[PDB]
């Protein structure tokens, strides 16, 4: 439990570490006494307990702030059909269209994960690393959050060719087989690319277009809907909305992975 700890003698008072363990024991048992908190938003849960696509309501999407679009002065008129209206100097996104597009994109992610494809979560804004990493880990996928190197797809040999690759079974179990140099030097291309900030990742979208990689993205009021295969109308500048949508997609991918493993284990 807590090795390399030297308890104190009964005559002497508690030590700092003994006090820490005493307070930990208190916290895990009695600190939570008196009431149970209900109907309160805790940000971390948005990453760790995302809802299923079918359980999402318009109220839940509005609570996450998905509806809040860009300023009316920065409007991209090609996004007219996704807009419910304008309010307080900003455009409001139609959350029913958002719900439909999000369910469709979640089905796409679930199908791709169930087929064993490679899913890449690209988001390069400040505090998006946590959700991206968790989505990649629970979908058995991959993620980028520092910077998208241009040419990562169209120039894969000169960018990603040096990093190591791995053969795996139907159950995602390492086989530890030795790969030939030609096999190691092939391009490994994502089967699905999801972008949280498509406005700042035009290079990735264009590379996916050139390389025929279907792509999902959160299309804000100032973003181009036609640059992506499966747009999701929603707010991309709020971390809560981005994490909510990303958690939904990641849970869909996890469900697909679980279905794949269940079928392989029967």
Partner 1 sequence: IHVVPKLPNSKALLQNGVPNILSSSGFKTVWFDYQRYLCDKLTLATAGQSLESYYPFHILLKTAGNPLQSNIFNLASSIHNNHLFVENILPSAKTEPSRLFLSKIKDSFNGSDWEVVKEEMIYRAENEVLGQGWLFLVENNEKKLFILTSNNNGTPYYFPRNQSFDLNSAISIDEFATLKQMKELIGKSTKLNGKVQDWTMPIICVNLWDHAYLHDYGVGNRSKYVKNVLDNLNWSVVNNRIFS
Partner 2 sequence: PVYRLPPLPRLKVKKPIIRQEANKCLVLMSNLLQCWSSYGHMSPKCAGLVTELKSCTSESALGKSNINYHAARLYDRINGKPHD
Partner 3 sequence: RRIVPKLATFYSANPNHEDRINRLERLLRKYIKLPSQAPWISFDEYALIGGGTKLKPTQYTQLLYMLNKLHNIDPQLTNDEITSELSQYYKIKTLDEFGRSIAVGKRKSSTAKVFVVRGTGEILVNGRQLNDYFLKMKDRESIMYPLQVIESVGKYNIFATTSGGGPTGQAESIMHAIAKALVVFNPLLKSRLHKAGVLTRDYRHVER
Applying CB under 8 A, the residues found at the interface with partner 3 are 2-6, 16-17, 20, 24, 116, 118, 120, 122, 133, 136-137, 141-147, 149, 152, 160, 163-170, 175, 179, 183, 186, 188, 190
Size of the site for Mg ion (CB under 5 A): 3
CA end-to-end span of the chain:
38
Residues in the chain: 266
Cβ of residue 39: shortest distance to partner 1, in angstroms?
5
Reading phi first (left if > 0) and then psi (alpha if -120 to 50, else beta), residue 50 is in beta
Cβ of residue 20: shortest distance to partner 3, in angstroms?
6
Pick one of Mg ion, partner 2, partner 3, none as the site partner of residue 16 (Cβ within 5 to 8 A by kind): partner 3
Measured CA to CA, the distance from residue 146 to residue 129 in angstroms comes to: 8
For partner 1, the closer CB: 27 or 185:
27
Q: Which of 110, 220, 222, 236 binds partner 2 (CB under 8 A)?
A: 222
How many whole angstroms from its chain centre is CA 9?
50
Tell how strand 83-87 and strand 90-93 pair up.
antiparallel
In the shown chain, the binding pattern of residues 38 to 77 toward partner 1, with x for contact by CB under 8 A and - for none, equals: xxx-x-----------------------------------
**Tokens coding 213:** 């990689």
Cβ of residue 181: shortest distance to Mg ion, in angstroms?
43
Residue 207 sits in the site that holds Mg ion (CB under 5 A) = no
- Give the footprint of partner 2 on residues 69-128 (CB under 8 A): 73-74, 76
For Mg ion, the closer CB: 114 or 236:
236
Residue 220 sits in the site that holds Mg ion (CB under 5 A) = yes
Q: Which of 1, 3, 4, 34 binds partner 1 (CB under 8 A)?
A: 34
Measured CA to CA, the distance from residue 250 to residue 216 in angstroms comes to: 13
Burial of residue 158 (number of CB atoms within 10 Å: 0-12, 13-18, 19+): exposed
Measured CA to CA, the distance from residue 61 to residue 69 in angstroms comes to: 13
SS3 state of residue 92: strand
- Comparing C-alpha atoms, which of 148, 157, 249, 257 is closest to residue 198? 148
For partner 3, the closer CB: 95 or 204:
204
Torsion of CA 254, 255, 256, 258, to 10 degrees: 90
For partner 2, the binding residues (CB under 8 A) are 73-74, 76, 222
For Mg ion, the binding residues (CB under 5 A) are 220, 236-237
For partner 1, the binding residues (CB under 8 A) are 10, 13-14, 19, 21-23, 25-26, 29-40, 42
């Amino acid at each position: 439990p807590y090795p390399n700890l030297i308890p104190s003698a009964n005559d002497k008072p508690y030590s700092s570490q003994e006090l820490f363990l005493r307070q930990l024991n208190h916290s895990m048992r009695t600190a939570k006494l008196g009431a149970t908190i209900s109907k309160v938003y805790y940000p971390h849960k948005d990453i760790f307990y995302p809802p299923l696509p079918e359980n999402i309501t318009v109220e839940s999407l509005m609570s996450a702030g998905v509806h809040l679009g860009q300023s009316t002065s920065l409007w991209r008129s090609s996004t007219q059909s996704y807009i419910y209206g304008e309010y307080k100097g900003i455009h409001i996104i139609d959350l029913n269209q958002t719900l439909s597009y999000l369910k469709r994109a979640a089905k796409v992610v679930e199908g791709v994960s169930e087929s064993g494809g490679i899913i890449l979560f690209l988001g390069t804004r400040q505090g998006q690393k946590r959700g991206l990493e968790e989505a990649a880990k629970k979908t058995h996928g991959y993620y980028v959050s520092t910077r998208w190197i241009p040419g990562t797809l169209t120039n894969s040999t000169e960018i990603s060719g040096i990093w190591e690759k791995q053969e795996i079974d139907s159950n995602d179990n390492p086989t530890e087989r030795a790969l030939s140099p030609n096999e190691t030097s092939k391009q490994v291309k994502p089967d699905l690319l999801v972008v949280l900030n498509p406005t700042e990742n035009r290079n990735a979208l264009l590379e996916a277009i050139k390389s025929r990689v279907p792509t999902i993205a959160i299309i804000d009021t100032d973003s181009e809907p036609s640059l992506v295969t499966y747009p999701i109308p929603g707010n991309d500048d709020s971390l809560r909305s981005v994490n909510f949508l990303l958690g939904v997609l990641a849970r869909a991918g996890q469900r697909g992975l679980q279905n794949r493993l269940a079928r392989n284990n029967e």
